[PDB]
Amino acid sequence: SSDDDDDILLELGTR
């Protein structure tokens, strides 16, 4: 529950 995977969220999520 921290900020280490902000990369995954930023780049991905949108398709």
Added chain:
Amino acid sequence: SVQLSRGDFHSIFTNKQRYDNPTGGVYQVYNTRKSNRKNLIMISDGIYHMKALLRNQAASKFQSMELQRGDIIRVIIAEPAIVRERKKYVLLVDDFELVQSRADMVNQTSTFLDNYFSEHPNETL
């Protein structure tokens, strides 16, 4: 109790047929986080664990079912993703169904998929 798709995360990222249709796998929720970060979970195939990002109906179902570590799901709509510049692996899950709530953990000490492929740079798609 229920049979997981053992090792399937390895299949998804080493076999192009599986990569192209990574659905039907039965996985166990390995961890969840306590706003879009809520939707990033860890899942286990019984041998490996990996990160999964829930989107769309899967994100809605995460809320409506109070999805937690130990829950067993079947992924219905998904696509793989590799963040190649960070060597991070993710399964983007757009829909799943609940198989069993709060099942005994199948493998408490699994291998993180990203660590396995860090040592297997030639096998990964």
